[PDB]
Design a protein around this ligand. Structure first.
Ligand code: CMP
Ligand code: CMP
Ligand code: ZN
Ligand code: ZN
Lengths: 517, 266
């Protein structure tokens, strides 16, 4: 129940077993549904695009992110400057806790506003054209104003809740990759990334700051960088680069600018800002609130899955639209040269409306009308019967209908259907890989199924990835001195980021087969 | 036992098949009021015919996604309606007579109804059903409007529905094939693969017809149930008590007679 159990390859080059105590708060936070969702997404992503060389690195990074998320959740968990500060922290924690409820409230308010907008009417006469609500009850007119104000307020609170809930994870991440690239790869000491890496060029503003890591746990990254690289690349120059006084060892507007520049490049933060912008524009023109109905795609998981079929082959869809444009252009260049007389779109005999006397006009006519026509341009241009170019015209029309109407639209249909099939196959492959192999050691279930429920026992008690995450958290919370021998071994080996204590291809059973038998 | 009878009747009235038969009876009674109520019984072909059930399983497998994509269609058409009601109101005159206009987009509700009803059923979208935009200042905006409507609504979303149905067909076929393959390649009781039993000729067939027959296990359970407690032999009484405690460890998991006595059978 409270007892954790992990297996590592120890200093003796043998698989061992480590027992430790798991906190109930940590267990509850791990079983929390959003953490479970993050774990499922991580598993799916690594199984799709991951290799054994980087699998453990990605796993440890995911564990670190999860631990920081647990810290944030515990921080925001609910239990004249002083009263102002306590009220402010209470309010900010409330918004962080209720971010998702506020998002759903914004969606509901958008639906309510647009349902009210279904009652607008335009008239020349006042209630120049005026827009007004025509409904019997008379409550929709003030309800719309109240709901628009409430929706703007909810969007603002959603931005604040995001800033207080999900920005810290982004900052912690970016700080941790910057620290790792600086102290392992020497990205700025030796590599000096060019102007192409906009992230690397922007990250220069934080290296010399008083607190380069503020969300990242490793607060000794500057010391580590100094020790590792200064002795070879100039101790004084390294200290100048990192903005640390060497003499201070014996005895933040710039960082705020860096953090804000990082936040303003966040996709989710930018989406929430656009949501706020259209909420503000709704008070200028209420119909701008219709742009918030696009939030259903962002919100609903089923809608996201359905639209993933469209976006999976989005590049091929754009390419086939361009191919359609080119093919229709070729039909237009043939028409403008040989079939100009058939493009009269005027019933009146007095004034012609030739739609193919101009190349631009003929191309526009073709793209607009012949692609939306069921049988192609032959429905929309003059009948070719009783003419010298009749067979040429029927070949033209039939090839247009085949290549454009049938073949290219079939290509689009098949792209969408193949996207459906490919996504389904990806999900099935991830599920099969998880069912038939162990995440940590990669040993198949055929070996563990020698005993009844052997694979279940192995993946629930011996090599539980949740157990490994719990062990990492336990090491982090534990003090350095209190470490046992195995704990200190794995702690130092993790601080060096060597993922060889994770048992690769070996397990306790595969080691002591004879002695367990 | 009136209370038990009430409980049983409340259980029966929540049975799906019993409720379906009750509805069948209700429409049969309503047929004598209006004979055309007997047409509601033609829906019974879906309930009855296995082929029809299999065919409609393709529609119902992705039913949630079909409902969601219909809702997405409604939202997208609403967005096209909010654009039309603001910028293209003059093109929605559906009256041939010049004297009396029939503007279909002077009301937001009317324009949304027009869009959903007509532009989704039109082959090329709303551009077939509204006024031609040629010779107008908003001509390029109107052609972009019409072409995006035809692409996103007529092509993309109907393609999504088509693909949902086709993928349901494929997924159901794959499920049937996977079940058949699992039964062919593994034993139901012990889970040992056919590759091990195929050491001897027809070894897997012998194992699944004589050694670990699930029908045989069911027959043994029935035989124990019919047999009296006293008449049980030692093994019969052991398995009987262990079943009464509902411990399913007497079912051989991962082991068989051959895998046990390989040397002594050889
Ligand atoms: N190291 C692992 N830890 C947990 N689950 C694993 C591991 N390796 C494979 N799995 C499988 O992944 C499944 C995810 O959760 P389940 O409870 O379905 O059971 C799990 C196992 O079948
Ligand atoms: N324990 C089992 N009992 C019966 N059939 C099994 C068992 N395990 C696997 N099978 C397979 O399932 C098939 C169902 O009926 P068949 O006569 O086709 O042959 C059977 C075997 O191939
Ligand atoms: Zn394992
Ligand atoms: Zn068997």
């Amino acid at each position: 129940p409270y007892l954790g159990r992990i297996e590592i390859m120890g200093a003796s080059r043998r698989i061992e077993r480590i027992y430790f105590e798991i906190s109930e708060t940590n267990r509850a936070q791990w079983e929390m549904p959003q953490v479970k969702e993050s774990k499922r997404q991580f598993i799916f992503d690594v199984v799709n695009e991951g290799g054994e060389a980087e699998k453990m690195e990605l796993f440890v990074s995911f564990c670190e992110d999860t631990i920081f998320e647990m810290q944030i959740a515990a921080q925001i968990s609910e239990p004249f400057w002083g009263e102002l500060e306590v009220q402010r922290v209470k309010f900010l924690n409330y918004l962080s806790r209720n971010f998702y409820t506020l998002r759903f409230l914004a969606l509901f308010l958008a639906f309510a506003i647009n349902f009210i907008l279904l009652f607008y009417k335009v008239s020349d006469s006042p209630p120049m054209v005026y827009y007004f609500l025509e409904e019997s009850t008379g409550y929709m007119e003030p309800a719309l104003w109240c709901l628009s104000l409430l929706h703007t307020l909810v969007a603002f609170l959603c931005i604040i809740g995001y800033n207080c809930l999900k920005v810290p994870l982004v900052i912690f991440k970016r700080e941790k990759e910057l620290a790792r690239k600086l102290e392992f790869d020497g990205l700025y000491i030796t590599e000096q990334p060019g102007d192409d890496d906009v992230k690397g060029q922007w990250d220069r503003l934080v290296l010399n700051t008083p607190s380069f890591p503020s969300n990242y746990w490793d607060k000794f990254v500057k010391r580590k960088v100094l020790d590792k690289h200064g002795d070879i690349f100039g101790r004084e120059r390294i200290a100048e680069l990192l903005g640390m006084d060497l003499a201070s060892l014996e005895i933040d507007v710039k960082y705020q600018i860096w953090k804000f520049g990082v936040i303003f490049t966040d996709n989710s933060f930018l989406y929430l800002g656009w949501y706020m912008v259209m909420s503000l524009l709704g008070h200028y023109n209420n119909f701008f609130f219709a742009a918030h109905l696009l939030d259903i795609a962002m919100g609903v998981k089923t809608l996201r899955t359905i639209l993933s079929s469209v976006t999976h082959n989005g590049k091929q869809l754009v390419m086939t639209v361009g191919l359609l444009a080119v093919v229709v252009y070729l039909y237009t260049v043939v028409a403008f040269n040989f079939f100009r007389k058939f493009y009269n779109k005027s019933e009146d005999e007095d004034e012609p409306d030739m739609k193919c006397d101009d190349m631009m006009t003929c191309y526009l006519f073709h793209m607009y009308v012949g692609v939306r026509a069921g049988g192609g341009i032959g429905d929309e241009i003059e009948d070719p019967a009783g003419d010298e170019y009749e067979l040429y015209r029927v070949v033209f029309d039939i090839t247009f209908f085949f290549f454009v109407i049938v073949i290219l639209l079939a290509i689009i249909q098949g792209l969408i259907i193949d996207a459906f099939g490919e996504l389904r196959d990806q999900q099935e492959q991830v599920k099969e890989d998880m069912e038939t192999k162990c995440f940590i050691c990669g040993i198949g279930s055929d070996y563990f199924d020698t005993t009844p429920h052997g694979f279940e026992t192995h993946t629930l008690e011996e090599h539980n990835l949740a157990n490994y995450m719990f062990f990492l958290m336990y090491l982090i919370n534990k003090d350095e001195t209190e470490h046992t021998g195995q704990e200190s071994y794995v702690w130092k080996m993790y601080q060096e980021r060597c993922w060889d204590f994770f048992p690769a291809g070996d397990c306790f059973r595969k080691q002591y087969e004879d002695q367990l038998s």
